[PDB]
């Protein structure tokens, strides 16, 4: 129990309600990148030079579970093993054993000023209510205010709302035998809503995002495969 419990609930529920809705039929969402089971879509949104482009990606990763995926996405001790867009980060506050507040600076992209971000990062399990309701593991990373990290004059403060949402499919093997990682697949939906917090050139933001989101999703998912391949399956 902590002062951000209701905000956590709010963000989790929003993501379970809206982030899992199909965008495939919406004229405003475009398939920007596809590779293997990975599809990255974007809706181009610019409001008075504030480029908000909502981003949504789906992926299907063999040999890993949603619990595993969300653990490696959330766990700060393995962050630098896969993250490539950050200059530095540190934990500002531990709120609960599944919830922390992180301050991070991003690598500068010319010609825009450097961005920093201040966000609550929470990992949650959403129980299946019925058999056939998928169990869902989710990590929500969303900007919050914290007195220890006011606006500074060195960076533009971005605001983020990101979720990594995972459901795991197990194909029953032949009879009474072990479920191997060949029999498991993690369905991922990744969404990112980023307000750069200030003016940025749209064409540059868009080129970066189109390169960087796909790069992250391949690298991060391959990483989870690599770290887990030897291990017993954590469902
Ligand atoms: C050299 C390239 C540097 C690009 C950095 C641009 C600055 C972006 C500012 C906010 C980004 C927020 C992304 C979310 C981070 C955390 O939830 C999480 C844990 O670290 N990681 C990811 O979701 C992993 C996401 C990895 C992919 C992120 C790239 C995003 C590129 C487009 C965003 C640009 C918006 C801000 C304006 C930057 C000025 C050009």
UniProtKB/Swiss-Prot annotation:
Gene Ontology molecular functions: ceramide 1-phosphate binding; ceramide 1-phosphate transfer activity; ceramide binding; ceramide transfer activity; identical protein binding; kinase activity; phosphatidylinositol-4-phosphate binding
Domain (START): residue spans on this chain: 8-229
Annotated effect of mutating residue 104 to A: No effect on ceramide transfer activity
Binding, an N-acylsphing-4-enine: 83, 104, 141, 190
Disease with which this protein is associated in UniProt: Neurodevelopmental disorder with hypotonia, speech delay, and dysmorphic facies: An autosomal dominant disorder characterized by mild to profound developmental delay with hypotonia, delayed motor skills, impaired intellectual development, poor or absent speech, and behavioral abnormalities. Some patients are non-verbal and non-ambulatory. Additional features may include early feeding difficulties, poor overall growth, seizures, brain imaging abnormalities, and dysmorphic facial features.
Organism name: Homo sapiens (Human)
Functional note: Shelters ceramides and diacylglycerol lipids inside its START domain and mediates the intracellular trafficking of ceramides and diacylglycerol lipids in a non-vesicular manner.
Keywords in alphabetical order: Coiled coil, Cytoplasm, Disease variant, Endoplasmic reticulum, Golgi apparatus, Intellectual disability, Lipid transport, Lipid-binding, Phosphoprotein, Transport
Tissue: Widely expressed.
Cytoplasm in keyword set: yes
Comment, domains: The START domain recognizes ceramides and diacylglycerol lipids, interacts with membranes, and mediates the intermembrane transfer of ceramides and diacylglycerol lipids. The PH domain targets the Golgi apparatus.
Protein name from the UniProt record: Ceramide transfer protein
GO annotation, cellular component aspect: cytosol; endoplasmic reticulum membrane; Golgi apparatus; mitochondrion; nucleoplasm
């Amino acid at each position: 129990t902590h002062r951000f419990v209701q905000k956590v609930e709010e963000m989790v529920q929003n993501h379970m309600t809206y982030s899992l809705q199909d965008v495939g039929g919406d004229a405003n969402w475009q398939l920007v990148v596809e590779e293997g089971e990975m599809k990255v879509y974007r809706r181009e949104v610019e409001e008075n030079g504030i480029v908000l482009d909502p981003l949504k990606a789906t992926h299907a990763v063999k040999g890993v579970t949603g619990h595993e995926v969300c653990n490696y996405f959330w766990n700060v001790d393995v962050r630098n093993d896969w993250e490539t867009t950050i200059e530095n980060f540190h934990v500002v506050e531990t709120l609960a054993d599944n919830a922390i507040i992180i301050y991070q600076t991003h690598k500068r992209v010319w010609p825009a000023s450097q961005r920093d971000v201040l966000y609550l990062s929470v990992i949650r399990k959403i129980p299946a209510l019925t058999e056939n309701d998928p169990e869902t593991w989710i990590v929500c990373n969303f900007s919050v205010d914290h007195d220890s990290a006011p606006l500074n004059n060195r960076c533009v403060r971005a605001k983020i709302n990101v979720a990594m949402i995972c459901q795991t499919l197990v194909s029953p093997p032949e009879g009474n035998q072990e479920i191997s990682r060949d029999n498991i697949l993690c369905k991922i939906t990744y969404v990112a809503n980023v307000n750069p917090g200030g003016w940025a050139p749209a064409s540059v933001l868009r080129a970066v995002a189109k390169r960087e989101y796909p790069k992250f999703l391949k690298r991060f998912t391959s990483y989870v495969q690599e770290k887990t391949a030897g291990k017993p399956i954590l469902f």
